[PDB]
Design a protein around this nucleic acid. Structure first.
Ligand SMILES: [Mg+2]
Ligand SMILES: [Mg+2]
Ligand SMILES: [Mg+2]
Ligand SMILES: [Mg+2]
Ligand SMILES: [Mg+2]
Ligand SMILES: [Mg+2]
Ligand SMILES: [Mg+2]
Ligand SMILES: [Mg+2]
Ligand SMILES: [Mg+2]
Ligand SMILES: [Mg+2]
Ligand SMILES: [Mg+2]
Ligand SMILES: [Mg+2]
Ligand SMILES: [Mg+2]
Ligand SMILES: [Mg+2]
Ligand SMILES: [Mg+2]
Ligand SMILES: [Mg+2]
Ligand SMILES: [Mg+2]
Ligand SMILES: [Mg+2]
Ligand SMILES: [Mg+2]
Ligand SMILES: [Mg+2]
Ligand SMILES: [Zn+2]
Lengths: 50, 69, 102, 91
RNA sequence: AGCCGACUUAGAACUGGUGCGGACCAGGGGAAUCCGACUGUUUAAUUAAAACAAAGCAUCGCGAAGGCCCGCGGCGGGUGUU
RNA sequence: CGAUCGAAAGGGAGUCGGGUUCAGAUCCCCGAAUCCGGAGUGGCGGAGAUGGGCGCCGCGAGGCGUCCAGUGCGGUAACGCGACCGAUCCCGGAGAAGCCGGCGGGAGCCCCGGGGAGAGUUCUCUUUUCUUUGUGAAGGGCAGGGCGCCCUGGAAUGGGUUCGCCCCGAGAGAGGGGCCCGUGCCUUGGAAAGCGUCGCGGUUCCGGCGGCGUCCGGUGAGCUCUCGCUGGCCCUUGAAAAUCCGGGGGAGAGGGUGUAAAUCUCGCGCCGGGCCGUACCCAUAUCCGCAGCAGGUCUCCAAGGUGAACAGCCUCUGGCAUGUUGGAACAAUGUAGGUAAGGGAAGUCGGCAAGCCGGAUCCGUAACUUCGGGAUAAGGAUUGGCUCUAAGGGCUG
């Protein structure tokens, strides 16, 4: 809703910031196993709880 | 907004300390004198083209005049 | 209170695509007064024709846009509807200009 | 003209609830909605407001009365008995 | 006497290849039997009923340290602001 | 009278107009306001309040000195005027009230007759058809609406009066006033802005500059909203508190006749208003049903015609692309629609399904009954178009 509270909006802010892909330079590292971001979330598919 | 019926009270409202500006609107069958004070925009309505011109010289010199168009 | 209106079609006359005379006899046969079109409704509507300027006067209530309607009827009669355009420069007057493409 | 022959107030109930029940409730529904005379101002503007409450339109006087009538015969006799006992006690 | 305006109702004449609530909108009816008075409600996803409820009628308990009931327990609680 | 919590639909002071973005606006910009809180010196003005007597003087106009008064004033009244001291205490009001019916007023929308401006048709006709044609909050004035407000006067041959009601010697009619709401009109705002139309600029990056116009009327059992009056219903009587105000009391305070005092809900002047939410969807694709699922999910606005109608059908503003695809064929059997000679339920467990009837006007209407009904009982007749006639009203003298 548009009638958010501060803690809910801050939680949504963090979950917005975690929803970006991995930077390109991390898999040029030596001890690297990550191919992509597997913890990604789409707004239509996964409904974040709440 | 406030309307001043007489000419004599208009001079006191223009000579107030809080009079920011005075502006003259020249339309048909009417001359309008508007003093922007702190709270109200005081308007003097003159339907005499001779008295409008003499009052225009009779404004106080410390007040800022903006002849509108 | 006399009502006087002017219709100045200077531009189509100087271009030669239309002549003001054939417009003026079309007016003098085609203005209706009190439901009667022929014979000018008596001597109440007078029409003078200057050089590409037709002046009309009337002491009965005469609508100005009736002249616009009759002029657009004349342009449709002589296929000038897609070329000329009847506008009002000042009031009690009408102008024949062109469409402003290119 | 005369609209109904034997039903009065209870003609609003139509063809329901039983003839004897309608005949019972007819007396209550007449006396409940009738306007009584006022004992204080004399005007006939003593109208029921709720059960036990009768309000006068002119005098603005409201009286605790009966449920369907302004006065009950079970209380008029009590009023008489209390005034005779009041005279008896003081002699 | 003059000047103004709003929708209706009734009647008459004429008229169409008897068609005219021209589309749309829009009750089939009657004589009876059984049950439930009726209005209402009900098995969400097989049963809407004659089942339930209902007003009316009739019994039963109780005058408050009481009747009925709740609660592991309290000078506990509901009916009871009775 | 119980800490405290408990409503983004209850209560709850106070913001509106124009413009602006690729995406935000009662929040940004401009212009107009407004509410609350604050103040020693209280910033100013006004009110409190500057009056009378005596004795002199001055011709008088008036001037000094004493003795006092002065916490305002007007109206018969309803009450009014810009203020107009007062505490602990007490009383009262507002917040603060259901559902339904009828009527009246005011807006908005629709409707009709004209003037403009711009468009559409013009094969023939059409002074024709379409679009548009205005003013915020706050203040002041005036209409209009309401009054269970006041004064005179005393009424039956009873009157006044509504749609209905209802009112009156506890004072009707008839005259004269008073109050409340005034969302309507005018004015300040405010034409400077907005809109329509025409034309010039900036070669453009422009709240660019100009010329005109934004007008006059009439109507309505119209629809919606709102205000008000009156009535009906209840064995149903339809919230509380925060907060605010008025009154009754008169403990007190202030000054001795003035650079008057205490005090002020009057007019201005000064400062401030912190924290959180604000984008978008809101539903045959942004929510819940495993999904862009024919399901479900609370509200506001509500044009023209036909018509009783927020019914159905067509259209305007606005919107969309036929609902997770297209092309070509037109076989059966399907699904969804129809139509059928003659017969008319012979079909079937069973008139299942389908069909008949249907609106309105005119008559007409049984058995039975709890007298209310049954009842649109049943039964028939009429219905188009066009041209007329008659009847049903206000305004002015
Ligand atoms: Mg979902
Ligand atoms: Mg039998
Ligand atoms: Mg039943
Ligand atoms: Mg079931
Ligand atoms: Mg079923
Ligand atoms: Mg709270
Ligand atoms: Mg709230
Ligand atoms: Mg009277
Ligand atoms: Mg302008
Ligand atoms: Mg007092
Ligand atoms: Mg928004
Ligand atoms: Mg879809
Ligand atoms: Mg399709
Ligand atoms: Mg398609
Ligand atoms: Mg057949
Ligand atoms: Mg047949
Ligand atoms: Mg058979
Ligand atoms: Mg058989
Ligand atoms: Mg059937
Ligand atoms: Mg029957
Ligand atoms: Zn009384």
């Amino acid at each position: 809703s548009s009638h958010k509270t501060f803690r809910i909006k801050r939680f949504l802010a963090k979950k917005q910031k975690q929803n970006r892909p991995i930077p390109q330079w991390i898999w040029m590292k030596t001890g690297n196993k990550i191919r992509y971001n597997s913890k990604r979330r789409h707004w239509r598919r996964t409904k974040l709880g709440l | 907004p406030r309307k001043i019926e007489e000419i004599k009270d208009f001079l006191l409202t223009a000579r107030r300390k809080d009079a920011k500006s005075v502006k003259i609107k020249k339309n048909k069958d009417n001359v309008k004198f508007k003093v922007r004070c702190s709270r109200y925009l005081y308007t003097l309505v003159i339907t005499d083209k001779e008295k409008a011109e003499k009052l225009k010289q009779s404004l106080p010199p410390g007040l800022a005049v903006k002849e509108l168009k | 209170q006399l009502l006087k209106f002017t219709l100045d079609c200077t531009h189509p006359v100087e271009d030669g695509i239309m002549d003001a005379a054939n417009f003026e006899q079309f007016l003098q046969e085609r203005i209706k007064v009190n439901g009667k079109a022929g014979n000018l409704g008596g001597g109440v509507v007078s029409l003078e024709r200057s050089k590409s300027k037709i002046t009309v006067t009337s002491e009965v209530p005469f609508s100005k846009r009736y002249l616009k309607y009759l002029t657009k009827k004349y342009l449709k009669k002589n296929n000038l509807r897609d070329w000329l355009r009847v506008v009002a420069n000042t009031k009690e007057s009408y102008e024949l200009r062109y469409f402003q493409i290119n | 003209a005369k609209r109904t022959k034997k039903v009065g107030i209870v003609g609003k109930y139509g063809t329901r609830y039983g003839a004897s029940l309608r005949k019972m409730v007819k007396k209550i529904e007449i006396s409940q909605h009738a306007k009584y005379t006022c004992s204080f101002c004399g005007k006939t503007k003593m109208k029921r407001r709720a059960v036990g409450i009768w309000h006068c339109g002119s005098c603005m006087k409201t009286v605790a009365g009966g449920a369907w009538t302004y006065n009950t015969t079970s209380a008029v006799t009590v009023k008489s008995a209390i005034r005779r006992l009041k005279e008896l006690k003081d002699q």
